[PDB]
Scaffold this active site. Structure first.
Site, PDB file in Angstrom:
ATOM      1  N   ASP A 150       0.759   9.113  17.945  1.00  0.00           N
ATOM      2  CA  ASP A 150      -0.117   8.540  16.900  1.00  0.00           C
ATOM      3  C   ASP A 150      -0.445   7.081  17.198  1.00  0.00           C
ATOM      4  OD1 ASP A 150      -1.757   8.685  14.733  1.00  0.00           O
ATOM      5  OD2 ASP A 150      -0.165   8.556  13.221  1.00  0.00           O
TER       6      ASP A 150
ATOM      7  N   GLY B   1       0.819  -1.208   0.000  1.00  0.00           N
ATOM      8  CA  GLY B   1       0.000   0.000   0.000  1.00  0.00           C
ATOM      9  C   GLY B   1       0.847   1.249   0.000  1.00  0.00           C
ATOM     10  N   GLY B   2       0.197   2.360  -0.330  1.00  0.00           N
ATOM     11  CA  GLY B   2       0.871   3.640  -0.465  1.00  0.00           C
ATOM     12  C   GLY B   2       0.038   4.776   0.089  1.00  0.00           C
ATOM     13  N   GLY B   3       0.722   5.885   0.349  1.00  0.00           N
ATOM     14  CA  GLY B   3       0.112   7.162   0.724  1.00  0.00           C
ATOM     15  C   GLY B   3       0.910   8.265   0.057  1.00  0.00           C
TER      16      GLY B   3
ATOM     17  N   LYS C  49      10.134   0.647   3.684  1.00  0.00           N
ATOM     18  CA  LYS C  49       9.378   1.910   3.497  1.00  0.00           C
ATOM     19  C   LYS C  49      10.097   2.789   2.477  1.00  0.00           C
ATOM     20  CE  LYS C  49       7.730   6.097   5.862  1.00  0.00           C
ATOM     21  NZ  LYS C  49       7.202   6.625   7.150  1.00  0.00           N
TER      22      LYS C  49
ATOM     23  N   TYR D  13       2.497  10.339   1.758  1.00  0.00           N
ATOM     24  CA  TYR D  13       3.644  10.270   2.682  1.00  0.00           C
ATOM     25  C   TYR D  13       4.673   9.170   2.368  1.00  0.00           C
ATOM     26  CZ  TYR D  13       0.761  13.253   5.742  1.00  0.00           C
ATOM     27  OH  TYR D  13       0.011  14.272   6.267  1.00  0.00           O
ATOM     28  N   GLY D  14       4.224   7.981   1.961  1.00  0.00           N
ATOM     29  CA  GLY D  14       5.159   6.871   1.697  1.00  0.00           C
ATOM     30  C   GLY D  14       4.575   5.667   0.965  1.00  0.00           C
ATOM     31  N   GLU D  15       5.456   4.729   0.601  1.00  0.00           N
ATOM     32  CA  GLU D  15       5.107   3.429  -0.015  1.00  0.00           C
ATOM     33  C   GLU D  15       5.751   2.298   0.800  1.00  0.00           C
ATOM     34  OE1 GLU D  15       3.186   2.353  -2.062  1.00  0.00           O
ATOM     35  OE2 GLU D  15       2.887   3.633  -3.818  1.00  0.00           O
ATOM     36  N   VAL D  16       4.981   1.253   1.130  1.00  0.00           N
ATOM     37  CA  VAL D  16       5.480   0.127   1.954  1.00  0.00           C
ATOM     38  C   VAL D  16       5.575  -1.168   1.145  1.00  0.00           C
ATOM     39  CG1 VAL D  16       5.331  -1.049   4.171  1.00  0.00           C
ATOM     40  CG2 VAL D  16       4.250   1.148   3.912  1.00  0.00           C
TER      41      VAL D  16
HETATM   42  C1  LIG Z   1       1.385   0.927  10.262  1.00  0.00           C
HETATM   43  O1  LIG Z   1       2.643   0.628   9.650  1.00  0.00           O
HETATM   44  C2  LIG Z   1       3.210   1.483   8.770  1.00  0.00           C
HETATM   45  C3  LIG Z   1       2.627   2.702   8.411  1.00  0.00           C
HETATM   46  C4  LIG Z   1       3.261   3.538   7.514  1.00  0.00           C
HETATM   47  C5  LIG Z   1       4.476   3.169   6.954  1.00  0.00           C
HETATM   48  C6  LIG Z   1       5.065   1.972   7.302  1.00  0.00           C
HETATM   49  F1  LIG Z   1       6.240   1.621   6.770  1.00  0.00           F
HETATM   50  C7  LIG Z   1       4.436   1.118   8.201  1.00  0.00           C
HETATM   51  C8  LIG Z   1       5.091  -0.150   8.553  1.00  0.00           C
HETATM   52  C9  LIG Z   1       4.504  -1.351   8.183  1.00  0.00           C
HETATM   53  C10 LIG Z   1       5.140  -2.539   8.539  1.00  0.00           C
HETATM   54  C11 LIG Z   1       6.358  -2.449   9.245  1.00  0.00           C
HETATM   55  C12 LIG Z   1       6.881  -1.190   9.559  1.00  0.00           C
HETATM   56  N1  LIG Z   1       6.238  -0.102   9.220  1.00  0.00           N
HETATM   57  C13 LIG Z   1       6.790  -3.769   9.481  1.00  0.00           C
HETATM   58  N2  LIG Z   1       5.921  -4.592   8.998  1.00  0.00           N
HETATM   59  N3  LIG Z   1       4.890  -3.878   8.393  1.00  0.00           N
HETATM   60  C14 LIG Z   1       3.795  -4.470   7.775  1.00  0.00           C
HETATM   61  C15 LIG Z   1       2.526  -3.938   7.919  1.00  0.00           C
HETATM   62  C16 LIG Z   1       1.446  -4.542   7.315  1.00  0.00           C
HETATM   63  C17 LIG Z   1       1.606  -5.703   6.558  1.00  0.00           C
HETATM   64  N4  LIG Z   1       0.538  -6.350   5.897  1.00  0.00           N
HETATM   65  C18 LIG Z   1      -0.793  -5.715   6.000  1.00  0.00           C
HETATM   66  C19 LIG Z   1      -1.791  -6.417   5.091  1.00  0.00           C
HETATM   67  N5  LIG Z   1      -1.848  -7.841   5.435  1.00  0.00           N
HETATM   68  C20 LIG Z   1      -2.870  -8.503   4.620  1.00  0.00           C
HETATM   69  C21 LIG Z   1      -0.525  -8.430   5.203  1.00  0.00           C
HETATM   70  C22 LIG Z   1       0.468  -7.795   6.174  1.00  0.00           C
HETATM   71  C23 LIG Z   1       2.895  -6.221   6.428  1.00  0.00           C
HETATM   72  C24 LIG Z   1       3.974  -5.624   7.034  1.00  0.00           C
END
Ligand SMILES: COc1cccc(F)c1-c1cc2c(cn1)cnn2-c1ccc(N2CCN(C)CC2)cc1
Length: 283
Positions: A131, A18-20, A40, A22-25
Protein backbone atom coordinates in the site's frame (compact mmCIF):
# COMPACT_ATOMS: atom_id res chain seq x y z
CA UNK A 1 2.96 -7.39 24.17
CA UNK A 2 0.04 -5.19 25.25
CA UNK A 3 -0.52 -2.85 28.26
CA UNK A 4 -3.98 -3.62 29.78
CA UNK A 5 -4.69 -0.11 31.04
CA UNK A 6 -6.11 3.33 30.21
CA UNK A 7 -3.64 5.22 27.96
CA UNK A 8 -5.00 8.60 29.23
CA UNK A 9 -2.86 7.64 32.28
CA UNK A 10 0.37 7.66 30.21
CA UNK A 11 -0.65 10.30 27.64
CA UNK A 12 -2.77 13.41 27.02
CA UNK A 13 -5.15 13.30 24.03
CA UNK A 14 -4.57 16.66 22.27
CA UNK A 15 -6.12 16.52 18.79
CA UNK A 16 -8.00 14.12 16.48
CA UNK A 17 -6.24 13.83 13.10
CA UNK A 18 -9.14 12.14 11.30
CA UNK A 19 -11.05 8.89 11.20
CA UNK A 20 -12.13 6.02 8.96
CA UNK A 21 -14.32 2.93 9.40
CA UNK A 22 -10.95 1.15 9.90
CA UNK A 23 -9.52 3.49 12.61
CA UNK A 24 -9.17 6.85 14.44
CA UNK A 25 -5.82 8.75 14.67
CA UNK A 26 -4.91 11.02 17.60
CA UNK A 27 -2.11 13.49 18.29
CA UNK A 28 -1.01 13.06 21.90
CA UNK A 29 1.76 14.00 24.38
CA UNK A 30 3.60 11.71 26.78
CA UNK A 31 2.67 13.02 30.27
CA UNK A 32 6.14 12.08 31.66
CA UNK A 33 8.64 12.32 28.79
CA UNK A 34 6.85 15.24 27.10
CA UNK A 35 7.43 13.83 23.59
CA UNK A 36 4.60 13.84 21.06
CA UNK A 37 3.07 10.58 19.82
CA UNK A 38 0.60 9.34 17.26
CA UNK A 39 -2.15 7.19 18.81
CA UNK A 40 -4.19 4.91 16.50
CA UNK A 41 -7.54 4.02 18.11
CA UNK A 42 -9.51 0.98 16.93
CA UNK A 43 -12.95 0.09 18.33
CA UNK A 44 -12.74 -3.69 19.02
CA UNK A 45 -16.09 -5.22 20.18
CA UNK A 46 -16.03 -8.64 21.99
CA UNK A 47 -17.56 -10.55 19.04
CA UNK A 48 -15.25 -9.39 16.18
CA UNK A 49 -11.88 -11.14 15.51
CA UNK A 50 -8.62 -9.48 16.70
CA UNK A 51 -6.05 -11.33 14.43
CA UNK A 52 -5.86 -8.52 11.82
CA UNK A 53 -4.79 -6.00 14.49
CA UNK A 54 -2.45 -8.49 16.25
CA UNK A 55 -0.64 -8.90 12.90
CA UNK A 56 -0.27 -5.11 12.46
CA UNK A 57 1.22 -4.71 15.96
CA UNK A 58 3.60 -7.66 15.42
CA UNK A 59 4.73 -6.02 12.12
CA UNK A 60 5.36 -2.68 13.83
CA UNK A 61 6.98 -4.20 16.99
CA UNK A 62 9.26 -6.41 14.84
CA UNK A 63 10.34 -3.48 12.56
CA UNK A 64 13.21 -1.35 13.84
CA UNK A 65 14.35 0.83 10.96
CA UNK A 66 14.85 4.58 10.40
CA UNK A 67 12.51 4.80 7.38
CA UNK A 68 9.66 2.93 9.13
CA UNK A 69 7.34 4.53 11.70
CA UNK A 70 8.60 3.70 15.15
CA UNK A 71 6.38 1.77 17.57
CA UNK A 72 6.25 2.47 21.31
CA UNK A 73 3.53 0.24 22.61
CA UNK A 74 -0.16 -0.54 22.58
CA UNK A 75 -3.00 -0.24 25.09
CA UNK A 76 -6.18 -2.35 25.38
CA UNK A 77 -8.85 -0.60 27.47
CA UNK A 78 -12.67 -0.38 27.49
CA UNK A 79 -12.90 -2.48 24.28
CA UNK A 80 -10.75 0.14 22.45
CA UNK A 81 -7.26 -0.69 21.20
CA UNK A 82 -4.74 2.17 21.10
CA UNK A 83 -1.57 1.70 19.00
CA UNK A 84 1.18 4.15 20.05
CA UNK A 85 3.75 5.44 17.53
CA UNK A 86 6.26 8.22 16.84
CA UNK A 87 4.64 11.49 15.75
CA UNK A 88 5.27 12.69 12.19
CA UNK A 89 4.23 16.31 12.44
CA UNK A 90 4.07 17.33 8.77
CA UNK A 91 1.82 14.35 8.05
CA UNK A 92 1.70 12.42 4.79
CA UNK A 93 3.07 13.57 1.43
CA UNK A 94 -0.55 13.85 0.27
CA UNK A 95 -1.46 16.05 3.25
CA UNK A 96 1.57 18.17 2.28
CA UNK A 97 1.33 18.33 -1.56
CA UNK A 98 -2.32 19.33 -1.30
CA UNK A 99 -1.02 22.54 0.28
CA UNK A 100 2.32 22.96 -1.52
CA UNK A 101 1.48 21.72 -4.99
CA UNK A 102 3.86 19.47 -6.86
CA UNK A 103 7.23 18.38 -5.58
CA UNK A 104 10.51 18.92 -7.40
CA UNK A 105 12.66 16.28 -9.02
CA UNK A 106 15.22 16.40 -6.19
CA UNK A 107 12.58 16.31 -3.47
CA UNK A 108 11.02 13.35 -5.29
CA UNK A 109 14.42 11.69 -5.62
CA UNK A 110 15.11 12.00 -1.89
CA UNK A 111 11.67 10.63 -1.00
CA UNK A 112 12.13 7.72 -3.40
CA UNK A 113 15.57 6.91 -1.96
CA UNK A 114 14.19 6.91 1.57
CA UNK A 115 11.21 4.70 0.74
CA UNK A 116 13.47 2.27 -1.13
CA UNK A 117 15.55 1.97 2.07
CA UNK A 118 12.42 1.14 4.05
CA UNK A 119 11.22 -1.32 1.43
CA UNK A 120 14.60 -3.06 1.21
CA UNK A 121 14.51 -3.47 4.99
CA UNK A 122 10.89 -4.79 4.94
CA UNK A 123 11.62 -7.23 2.14
CA UNK A 124 14.72 -8.58 3.91
CA UNK A 125 12.36 -9.30 6.88
CA UNK A 126 10.05 -11.15 4.40
CA UNK A 127 7.33 -8.48 4.82
CA UNK A 128 5.47 -6.57 2.06
CA UNK A 129 3.85 -3.13 2.46
CA UNK A 130 1.47 -3.52 -0.50
CA UNK A 131 0.00 0.00 0.00
CA UNK A 132 2.78 2.39 -0.95
CA UNK A 133 1.30 5.73 -1.94
CA UNK A 134 1.67 9.46 -1.03
CA UNK A 135 -0.89 9.15 1.77
CA UNK A 136 1.17 6.41 3.52
CA UNK A 137 4.59 8.08 3.28
CA UNK A 138 4.88 10.26 6.40
CA UNK A 139 7.13 13.26 6.99
CA UNK A 140 8.34 14.44 10.44
CA UNK A 141 9.19 18.06 11.39
CA UNK A 142 12.88 17.13 10.77
CA UNK A 143 12.10 16.16 7.12
CA UNK A 144 12.71 12.47 7.73
CA UNK A 145 10.67 9.93 5.72
CA UNK A 146 8.57 7.25 7.41
CA UNK A 147 6.52 4.40 5.86
CA UNK A 148 3.15 3.95 7.62
CA UNK A 149 -0.37 2.42 7.45
CA UNK A 150 0.50 -1.31 7.49
CA UNK A 151 -3.19 -2.15 8.12
CA UNK A 152 -3.56 -3.67 4.63
CA UNK A 153 -0.21 -5.54 4.95
CA UNK A 154 -1.66 -6.85 8.21
CA UNK A 155 -5.06 -7.69 6.54
CA UNK A 156 -3.48 -9.90 3.83
CA UNK A 157 -1.15 -11.48 6.46
CA UNK A 158 -4.04 -12.25 8.83
CA UNK A 159 -5.82 -13.88 5.87
CA UNK A 160 -2.71 -15.90 4.84
CA UNK A 161 -2.67 -17.37 8.40
CA UNK A 162 -6.49 -17.88 8.42
CA UNK A 163 -5.98 -19.73 5.08
CA UNK A 164 -4.05 -22.66 6.76
CA UNK A 165 -7.57 -24.18 7.29
CA UNK A 166 -1.78 -28.89 -0.15
CA UNK A 167 -0.23 -31.76 -2.25
CA UNK A 168 -2.82 -32.24 -5.05
CA UNK A 169 -2.84 -28.45 -5.24
CA UNK A 170 -1.63 -26.80 -8.45
CA UNK A 171 1.43 -24.42 -8.29
CA UNK A 172 -0.53 -21.22 -9.06
CA UNK A 173 -3.05 -22.17 -6.31
CA UNK A 174 -0.10 -22.75 -3.93
CA UNK A 175 1.21 -19.31 -4.81
CA UNK A 176 -2.16 -17.71 -3.89
CA UNK A 177 -2.34 -19.79 -0.70
CA UNK A 178 1.19 -18.77 0.40
CA UNK A 179 2.00 -15.42 -1.27
CA UNK A 180 -1.35 -14.25 -2.79
CA UNK A 181 -0.07 -14.62 -6.41
CA UNK A 182 2.44 -11.76 -6.16
CA UNK A 183 5.76 -10.88 -4.49
CA UNK A 184 7.64 -8.03 -2.74
CA UNK A 185 8.35 -6.34 -6.11
CA UNK A 186 4.77 -5.05 -6.27
CA UNK A 187 5.98 -2.33 -3.83
CA UNK A 188 8.63 -1.22 -6.37
CA UNK A 189 5.89 -0.64 -8.94
CA UNK A 190 3.85 1.37 -6.40
CA UNK A 191 6.82 3.57 -5.73
CA UNK A 192 7.06 4.28 -9.45
CA UNK A 193 3.37 5.31 -9.44
CA UNK A 194 3.94 7.30 -6.24
CA UNK A 195 6.84 9.18 -7.88
CA UNK A 196 4.35 10.21 -10.58
CA UNK A 197 1.76 11.14 -7.87
CA UNK A 198 4.28 13.53 -6.26
CA UNK A 199 5.17 15.03 -9.66
CA UNK A 200 1.54 15.46 -10.86
CA UNK A 201 -0.77 15.53 -7.77
CA UNK A 202 -2.64 12.46 -9.17
CA UNK A 203 -1.56 8.91 -10.06
CA UNK A 204 -2.10 7.96 -13.69
CA UNK A 205 -5.69 7.22 -14.71
CA UNK A 206 -7.10 8.79 -11.50
CA UNK A 207 -10.05 10.23 -13.47
CA UNK A 208 -10.85 6.74 -14.87
CA UNK A 209 -13.20 4.46 -12.85
CA UNK A 210 -11.32 2.00 -10.54
CA UNK A 211 -12.98 -1.24 -11.72
CA UNK A 212 -12.23 -0.15 -15.30
CA UNK A 213 -8.55 0.49 -14.44
CA UNK A 214 -8.25 -3.04 -13.00
CA UNK A 215 -9.66 -4.36 -16.28
CA UNK A 216 -7.19 -2.23 -18.32
CA UNK A 217 -4.20 -3.46 -16.28
CA UNK A 218 -5.09 -7.10 -16.98
CA UNK A 219 -5.30 -6.67 -20.79
CA UNK A 220 -2.46 -7.99 -22.99
CA UNK A 221 -1.37 -4.64 -24.45
CA UNK A 222 -1.38 -2.54 -21.26
CA UNK A 223 1.38 0.09 -21.51
CA UNK A 224 2.98 1.25 -18.26
CA UNK A 225 2.30 4.94 -17.60
CA UNK A 226 4.85 7.72 -18.04
CA UNK A 227 5.27 11.31 -16.87
CA UNK A 228 3.01 13.71 -18.84
CA UNK A 229 5.64 16.45 -19.40
CA UNK A 230 8.79 15.18 -21.14
CA UNK A 231 10.86 18.43 -20.81
CA UNK A 232 10.13 19.31 -17.15
CA UNK A 233 12.13 16.23 -15.97
CA UNK A 234 15.50 14.64 -16.47
CA UNK A 235 16.47 11.49 -18.38
CA UNK A 236 17.35 9.86 -15.06
CA UNK A 237 13.84 10.55 -13.70
CA UNK A 238 12.06 9.19 -16.82
CA UNK A 239 14.30 6.09 -16.67
CA UNK A 240 13.64 5.57 -12.94
CA UNK A 241 9.97 5.39 -13.86
CA UNK A 242 10.43 3.23 -16.99
CA UNK A 243 12.37 0.73 -14.85
CA UNK A 244 10.30 0.72 -11.63
CA UNK A 245 7.22 0.43 -13.83
CA UNK A 246 8.42 -2.78 -15.50
CA UNK A 247 5.26 -4.78 -16.31
CA UNK A 248 6.95 -8.15 -15.69
CA UNK A 249 7.91 -8.87 -12.04
CA UNK A 250 10.48 -11.39 -13.38
CA UNK A 251 12.30 -8.38 -14.94
CA UNK A 252 11.43 -5.55 -12.41
CA UNK A 253 14.38 -4.69 -10.21
CA UNK A 254 14.51 -5.08 -6.43
CA UNK A 255 14.59 -2.25 -3.86
CA UNK A 256 18.32 -2.98 -3.35
CA UNK A 257 19.04 -2.89 -7.09
CA UNK A 258 16.97 0.33 -7.25
CA UNK A 259 19.04 2.06 -4.49
CA UNK A 260 22.03 2.05 -6.86
CA UNK A 261 19.91 3.84 -9.53
CA UNK A 262 21.29 7.18 -10.76
CA UNK A 263 18.34 9.29 -9.60
CA UNK A 264 18.30 7.99 -6.00
CA UNK A 265 22.08 7.56 -5.55
CA UNK A 266 23.12 11.12 -6.68
CA UNK A 267 24.67 13.32 -4.01
CA UNK A 268 23.00 16.23 -2.24
CA UNK A 269 19.92 14.20 -1.36
CA UNK A 270 18.96 14.92 2.24
CA UNK A 271 16.18 16.14 4.50
CA UNK A 272 17.04 19.78 3.67
CA UNK A 273 15.14 19.29 0.43
CA UNK A 274 12.08 18.28 2.43
CA UNK A 275 12.56 21.05 4.93
CA UNK A 276 12.34 23.48 1.98
CA UNK A 277 9.00 21.89 1.11
CA UNK A 278 7.73 22.15 4.71
CA UNK A 279 8.64 25.89 4.68
CA UNK A 280 6.24 26.16 1.73
CA UNK A 281 3.66 24.76 4.21
CA UNK A 282 3.52 27.96 6.35
CA UNK A 283 3.49 30.13 3.18
C1 LIG B 1 -0.96 7.53 6.83
O1 LIG B 1 -0.88 7.34 8.25
C2 LIG B 1 -1.82 6.64 8.92
C3 LIG B 1 -2.92 6.05 8.28
C4 LIG B 1 -3.84 5.33 9.02
C5 LIG B 1 -3.70 5.21 10.39
C6 LIG B 1 -2.62 5.79 11.03
F1 LIG B 1 -2.48 5.67 12.36
C7 LIG B 1 -1.68 6.52 10.30
C8 LIG B 1 -0.55 7.12 11.01
C9 LIG B 1 -0.43 8.50 11.08
C10 LIG B 1 0.66 9.05 11.75
C11 LIG B 1 1.58 8.16 12.34
C12 LIG B 1 1.37 6.78 12.23
N1 LIG B 1 0.34 6.31 11.58
C13 LIG B 1 2.58 8.95 12.94
N2 LIG B 1 2.32 10.20 12.73
N3 LIG B 1 1.13 10.31 12.01
C14 LIG B 1 0.57 11.52 11.61
C15 LIG B 1 0.00 11.66 10.36
C16 LIG B 1 -0.54 12.87 9.98
C17 LIG B 1 -0.50 13.97 10.83
N4 LIG B 1 -1.06 15.23 10.50
C18 LIG B 1 -1.74 15.33 9.19
C19 LIG B 1 -2.45 16.67 9.06
N5 LIG B 1 -1.48 17.75 9.25
C20 LIG B 1 -2.13 19.04 9.03
C21 LIG B 1 -0.92 17.66 10.60
C22 LIG B 1 -0.14 16.35 10.72
C23 LIG B 1 0.08 13.80 12.09
C24 LIG B 1 0.62 12.60 12.47
Amino acid sequence: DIFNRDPRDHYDLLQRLGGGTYGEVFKARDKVSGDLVALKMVKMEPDDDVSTLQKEILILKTCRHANIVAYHGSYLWLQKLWICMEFCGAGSLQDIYQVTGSLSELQISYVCREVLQGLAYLHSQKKIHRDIKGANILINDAGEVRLADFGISAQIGATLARRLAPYWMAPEVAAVALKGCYNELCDIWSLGITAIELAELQPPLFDVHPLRVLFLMTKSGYQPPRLKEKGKWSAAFHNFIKVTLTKSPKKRPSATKMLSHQLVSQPGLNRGLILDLLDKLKN
